[PDB]
Design a protein around this ligand. Structure first.
Ligand code: ZN
Lengths: 70, 286, 94, 287, 50, 191, 39
């Protein structure tokens, strides 16, 4: 039953995706990005991302409305 | 000439719903319909279908009917709603390969050159993949008739697609033995695959039923392969096939000996990360 | 005629079964390999040949009796080794 | 009146017809008809769906062409069995599900003949496995909006089970239409013959997997697994240090051994145990 | 004919303008990544026929 | 109007091939089919007239459609070459009329035979009592040449309108190549 | 490796309560959503 929701969470990644840039993280599983609309945000993550693929200055993906890491 | 066929689960369901809407006749009806789809890069694709009105009287079973006006306009609509979609051949419900299916194909080859048929299942029980397809080949050849023509089975499987895997995996909700680890292969091909070779061994036993008693045509072109299977039967255990077998067992299990040795120390380290949260937590909280 | 255990005949037996001399049977088998009716290898110092593949011939209702019986106890060998599978790996998957 | 327990039974064939026609022509809003079997005051059943072709370039629901449907309604009538049009659908591409002001007008032309034509929205993009994005709707009279009267007169605790999305709540829900809970009609005539036919491996596990390269790949992992254990000969050594909650934030830049080191052990086992076992069943079965 | 041309405008008023962008690279067969002439960079798909 | 479905069974057998009839045997029977499908259309717009054969290959040449343009297009260079096979000609004529959109129509077939038949008279009377239990009235009109005083066709129509059928006829062929418009003027005037 | 599992699951204890999110902030989330829908 856990493996049903394990794949179910990735509906958020679907098509209409915008691009920001990683800046730093406050803690575990919550970070700060800066969008290419110019304004910075305090965002949430998606848990399947390997965190150790982050930060040279990492181009990321953001949800177009709720605006968190994708 | 044709590599393989690709069948989607839409058309697989788009026969059985038609078998239910004609299942009220009770006595006898075969579901025969028109198969739609493309074929690109030498791989036969199957996408869409419908079914054509058809009847059959038992006495003088060479009188079939395909209402071609129903074949024209409904494909004219489907080409209009989807120009990418086109004809690919035909199909029939195929319990046991009825007799009209030698010239149903020749009736409607004026639309598709390689007019392929598809035999489906209406009562699902087997240990395999109950979707059959043939191909049309003819011969002015060896012994039977001056005009000879016999279907030959091309390999068949159920092809997937990204859009339908959402719907296919939604409609199951019953059992799906995923999480491929050390035991997905054990059951998809080691429990089942050995019993896969069961019915392939048992199939040539069914041809073997003619030793002196069965049907009157005997062999001519069936035994050159069977003479080769016992000839190409693999090498016996006398050579360094003994020695090179123990060679790799003394190589493959070394990696297993190293990897299992690693797994102990990892979980031993995880024990220490749990004694750091037991003894250093009772004095603080209580 | 020889079984699949050896099928390894010598040149002296060819000189017996075809009454042809030693200095021509090497020319005889290279013609047989070139036409393609046999596929094997040729030794020269041990005076033997390792024939592997032969041309398939026809047969009557007596050679199917051998192919019935050599097939038949090979059926239960598939039964016997798979009997270990569903009985030892049974609790791995219901 | 209606009892807000309207319980739309659909099908198994139509959902595949809905998503295929919604995905192949995706960014233009496509539409079609719903040819089902109407039942009582409470429920409705839609078993068959045929798609309607478009009119021109542009995202619209343009209009129905009754030349097309009248020939289509008697097309399968002479072949299969009679049914009757119980509704219609369109497809929002990547929105969600609501009735737009363009969507509501072509609905209002269809509720004139029968008062129970269902407006259905499918979304073939926000759907992955256990999501098929759905929730068909149906209009409510704006006459009762002026009266300030709340419709649909709840007699069962079956309607208020799903919670509507806030983005659909921005639109005309719930001031012009309502949601309807649905389930699916599954049956063993279809259930078994799609399970046992989708992913069946034929003779793959009865192979040896490139026998010179499997033991070559058995070193292609182990060599860097040495140095990845040197990191595991490193990261444990800077413990009894700054309070390993701090060793959670700080390790988001560079790779860790401990998770990566139990990773390859699973890989270096199932690649070996499956391949070593399959070699030793070929020796018995093949002579 | 005076109702013909004025019927052309009856359905010409339903076309929608289109954002003019520019293709930056290509991730997969369907994952494209663009930047409009407005501003921000997007991740985008296509039609299956284009 | 009255509910029927007119189905003509054309004759592409190999004995209808000569030039004894004045335009052609093919064209004179075609325009006879044309003026009677104009007769069945203008008395009732619901009737459609398609054509079938009774040759070795009982082909649906043109589908049963209210259009006649496919009928006019196929009957040019139609190749009337083939051994006649009438023993399957009933089964292709009857089972076609059960594939129709309406079974409440009067099952009516006309059948054109212009070739010597090699049927068994016992096989057709088993097919006649098959049609007795299927309630089918077929008026067979003889064309071309045949066994004169047509053999096995008197006993078939007699065993067609038996058991209170009594409405069918058998228009036989006159063995003279005259103009065939007045030959078929009797079924167009009355039944 | 089994014994390092079988002697490891004893200090799981006092996992006191998996909190979903809130009572109050959930209600404040609902009020904020109702404000946006009215807007
Ligand atoms: Zn819409």
């Amino acid at each position: 039953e856990f493996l049903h929701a394990q794949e179910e969470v990735k509906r958020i990644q679907s098509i209409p995706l915008v691009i920001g840039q990683f800046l730093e993280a406050v803690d575990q599983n919550t970070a700060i990005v800066g969008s290419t609309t110019g304004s910075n945000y305090y965002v949430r993550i998606l848990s399947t991302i390997d965190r150790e693929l982050l930060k040279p200055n990492a181009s990321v993906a953001l949800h177009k409305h709720s605006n968190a890491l994708v | 000439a044709v590599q393989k066929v690709v069948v989607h689960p839409l058309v697989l369901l788009s026969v059985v719903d038609h078998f239910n809407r004609i299942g009220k006749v009770g006595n006898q009806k075969r579901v025969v319909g028109v198969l739609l789809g493309s074929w690109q890069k030498k791989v036969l694709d199957v996408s869409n279908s419908f079914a054509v009105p058809f009847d059959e009287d038992d006495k003088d079973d060479s009188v079939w009917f395909l209402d071609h006006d129903y074949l024209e306009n409904m494909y004219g609509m489907f080409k209009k709603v989807n120009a990418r979609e086109r004809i690919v051949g035909w199909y029939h419900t195929g319990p046991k390969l009825h007799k009209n299916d030698i010239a149903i194909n020749e009736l409607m080859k004026r639309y598709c050159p390689n007019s392929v048929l598809v035999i489906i299942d209406v009562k699902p029980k087997d240990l395999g993949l109950p979707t059959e397809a043939y191909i049309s080949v003819e011969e002015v050849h060896d012994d039977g008739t001056p005009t000879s023509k016999t279907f030959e089975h091309v390999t068949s499987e159920i092809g997937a697609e990204e859009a339908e895997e959402v719907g296919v995996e939604h409609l199951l909700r019953d059992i799906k033995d995923t999480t491929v680890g050390t035991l997905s292969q054990r059951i998809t091909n080691q429990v089942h695959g050995l019993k896969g070779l069961n019915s392939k061994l048992l199939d040539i036993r069914s041809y073997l039923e003619k030793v002196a008693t069965g049907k009157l045509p005997i062999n001519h072109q069936i035994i050159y392969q069977l003479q080769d299977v016992f000839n190409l039967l693999p090498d016996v255990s006398l050579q360094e096939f003994v020695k090179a077998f123990y060679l790799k067992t003394n190589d493959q299990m070394v990696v297993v000996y190293l990897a299992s040795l690693i797994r102990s120390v990892v979980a031993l380290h995880n024990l220490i990360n749990n004694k750091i949260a037991n003894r250093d937590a009772e004095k603080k909280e209580g | 005629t020889r079984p699949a255990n050896h099928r390894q005949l010598t040149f002296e037996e060819i000189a017996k079964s075809a009454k042809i001399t030693v200095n021509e049977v090497e020319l005889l088998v290279m013609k047989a390999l070139s036409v393609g009716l046999v596929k094997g290898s040729i030794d020269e110092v041990d005076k033997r040949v390792h024939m592997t593949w032969v041309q398939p011939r026809v047969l009557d209702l007596q050679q199917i009796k051998g192919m019935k019986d050599r097939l038949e106890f090979w059926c239960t060998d598939v039964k016997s080794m798979e009997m270990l599978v569903e009985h030892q790996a049974h609790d791995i998957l219901t | 009146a209606v009892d807000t327990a309207e319980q739309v039974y659909i099908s198994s064939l139509a959902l595949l017809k809905m998503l295929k026609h919604g995905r192949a022509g995706v960014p233009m809003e496509v539409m079609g008809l719903m040819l089902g079997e109407f039942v009582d005051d409470y429920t409705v059943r839609v078993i068959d769906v045929f798609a309607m072709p478009q009119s021109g370039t542009g995202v619209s629901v343009e209009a129905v062409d009754p030349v097309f449907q009248a020939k289509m309604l008697d097309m399968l009538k002479q072949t299969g069995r009679p049914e009757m049009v119980v509704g219609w659908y369109h497809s929002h591409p990547g929105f969600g599900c609501w009735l737009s002001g363009v969507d509501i007008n072509t609905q209002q032309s269809f509720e004139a003949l029968s008062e129970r034509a269902v407006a259905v929205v499918v979304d073939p993009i926000q759907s992955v496995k256990g999501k098929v994005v759905i929730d068909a709707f149906r209009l409510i009279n704006a006459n009762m909006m002026v009266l300030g009267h709340e419709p649909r007169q709840t007699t069962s605790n079956l309607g208020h089970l799903n919670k509507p999305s806030i983005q659909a709540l921005i639109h005309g829900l719930n001031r012009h239409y309502y949601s309807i809970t649905i389930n699916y009609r599954k049956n063993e005539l279809e259930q078994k013959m799609l399970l046992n036919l989708h992913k069946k491996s034929w003779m793959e596990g009865l192979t040896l997997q490139d026998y010179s390269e499997h033991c070559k790949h058995n070193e292609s992992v182990v060599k860097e697994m040495l140095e990845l254990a040197k990191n595991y000969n490193k990261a444990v050594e800077e413990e009894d240090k700054m309070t390993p909650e701090q060793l959670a934030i700080k390790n988001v830049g560079k790779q860790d051994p401990k998770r990566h080191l139990e990773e390859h052990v699973d890989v270096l086992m199932t690649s070996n145990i499956v391949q070593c076992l399959a070699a030793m069943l070929d020796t018995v079965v093949f002579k | 004919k005076q109702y013909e041309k004025s019927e052309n405008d009856l359905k010409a008023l339903q076309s929608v303008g289109q954002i003019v962008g520019e293709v930056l690279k290509q991730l997969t067969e369907e994952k494209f990544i663009v930047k409009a002439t407005n501003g921000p960079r997007y991740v985008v798909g296509c039609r299956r026929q284009l | 109007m009255v509910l029927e479905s007119t189905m003509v069974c054309v004759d592409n057998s190999e004995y209808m091939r000569n030039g004894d009839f004045l335009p052609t045997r093919l064209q004179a029977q075609q325009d006879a089919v044309n003026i009677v499908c104009h007769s069945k259309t203008r008395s009732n717009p619901e009737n459609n007239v398609g054509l079938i054969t009774l040759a070795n290959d009982c082909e649906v040449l043109t589908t049963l459609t209210p259009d006649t343009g496919r009928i006019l297009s196929k009957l040019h260079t139609v190749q009337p070459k083939g051994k006649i096979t009438f023993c399957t000609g009933i089964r292709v004529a009857h089972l076609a009329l059960k594939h129709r959109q309406g079974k409440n129509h009067k099952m009516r077939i006309i059948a054109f035979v212009g070739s010597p038949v090699e049927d068994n008279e016992k096989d057709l009377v088993k097919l006649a009592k098959r049609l007795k239990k299927e309630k089918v009235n077929v008026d067979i009109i003889n064309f071309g040449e045949e066994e004169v005083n047509t053999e096995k066709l008197t006993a078939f129509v007699n065993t067609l309108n038996g058991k209170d059928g009594t409405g069918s006829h058998l228009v036989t062929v006159p063995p003279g190549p005259s103009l065939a418009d007045a030959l078929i003027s009797s079924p167009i005037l009355a039944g | 490796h089994n014994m390092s599992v079988k002697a490891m699951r004893f200090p799981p204890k006092s996992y006191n309560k998996d909190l979903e999110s809130a009572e109050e902030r959930r209600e404040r989330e609902q009020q904020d959503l109702e404000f946006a829908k009215e807007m």
